[PDB]
Ligand binder design. Structure first.
Ligand SMILES: *[C@@H](CC(=O)OCC)[C@H](C[C@H]1CCNC1=O)NC(=O)[C@H](Cc1ccccc1)NC(=O)OC(C)(C)C
Ligand SMILES: *[C@@H](CC(=O)OCC)[C@H](C[C@H]1CCNC1=O)NC(=O)[C@H](Cc1ccccc1)NC(=O)OC(C)(C)C
Lengths: 181, 181
């Protein structure tokens, strides 16, 4: 649990930022170059607020599987000269299960906070607020609004981005290496 | 940092609870027997809500130093049959300075969340919302309301209870062994 939090702290310091769109404030992970990721429901517009600064969104790609099913991630390319430290190395080719995970959040409401969610099991299909969604990871821990975009981690692994929950169970979209080109 | 979070997680699972008084929701640490502690400004009444259950407060002791100066802690004795795991062992005789601390919070707003605040230095005197207060510990990390009562920790140490902050600096009241009889 300790090595997981250690990795997470370092990851967030190097690769995360706080973002505001018109739909809310989110944790954002930069992945490589000028590509980052948000939960789909962040619905980023042509500009976002990134650490309180206006940044133009050159592209966004709402992710779906081969059968059009929601994956609940949006990839976004930022009109930005600074490049993100390449963390593609830490993204698995398929859905990761781990015994001890940490969820890391970094917004105004939750500034640099970490939750030990423990066991993450590949959950797969879930009806998410009416929306059939695939590739979900599930953890038991009492979830809260404004945690969407939180980064799910274990030692040496970035497992996915937090997208949903109710009460005592949360879900992340798996963050798969092949989503990045 | 990892061993600190590890210790904290275990400490909170064993000794913390979520409490509501008329002045808010707080993190509460049970110390020994039926004695626990809250930040002074929690102003506990004759009953409190402890994990959603009504509990009678048999005693409360607002702590001050020999010269009457506020210490910003209230000790409270709960009308309760279950006894807290004795953690007096983990409380220093004087104000602890450490290189890596974690602040642990456990309420509805922040359920089982942990913050790496890093370096804790004995700050001592501070004018806290008009109130001259002593024995303060200071850490740099961007503080937030509803974190009061959070438990400040490092490996094998319970350093104090979070009582204040603004922006980017937070303060705990040192949790000293001799406060417990
Ligand atoms: C995070 C997103 C958000 O709107 O916060 C403001 C920045 C939130 C997860 C929270 C809410 C309570 N527990 C949590 O962990 N996500 C949602 O509320 C998502 C939003 C969504 C709706 C429909 C499709 C995709 C995403 N929905 C969600 O948890 O829905 C349930 C409760 C029906 C499962
Ligand atoms: C926690 C207590 C609270 O009222 O939350 C609701 C449960 C809060 C600390 C927060 C606020 C913003 N940053 C933080 O870390 N504590 C306070 O706001 C205390 C309350 C207090 C006032 C006067 C004497 C003693 C305690 N005050 C505080 O931070 O005051 C400043 C901002 C003037 C330093």
């Amino acid at each position: 649990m300790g090595p997981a939090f250690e990795f997470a702290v370092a990851m967030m310091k190097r690769n995360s930022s706080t973002v505001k769109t018109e739909y809310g404030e989110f944790t954002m992970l930069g992945i490589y170059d000028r590509w980052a990721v948000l939960p789909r429901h962040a619905k980023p517009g042509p500009t976002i607020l990134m650490n309180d600064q206006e940044v133009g969104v050159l592209d966004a790609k709402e992710l779906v599987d081969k059968d059009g099913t929601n994956l609940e991630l949006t990839l976004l390319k930022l009109n930005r000269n600074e490049k993100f430290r390449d963390i593609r190395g830490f993204l698995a080719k398929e859905e990761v299960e781990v015994n001890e995970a940490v969820l890391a959040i970094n917004t105004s409401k939750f500034p640099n906070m970490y939750i030990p969610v423990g066991q993450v099991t590949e959950y797969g299909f879930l009806n998410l607020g009416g929306t059939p969604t695939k590739r979900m990871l599930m953890y038991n821990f009492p979830t809260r609004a404004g945690q969407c975009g939180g980064v799910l981690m274990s030692t040496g692994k970035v497992l996915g981005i937090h997208v949903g929950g109710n009460g005592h169970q949360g879900f992340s979209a798996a963050l798969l290496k092949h989503y990045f080109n």
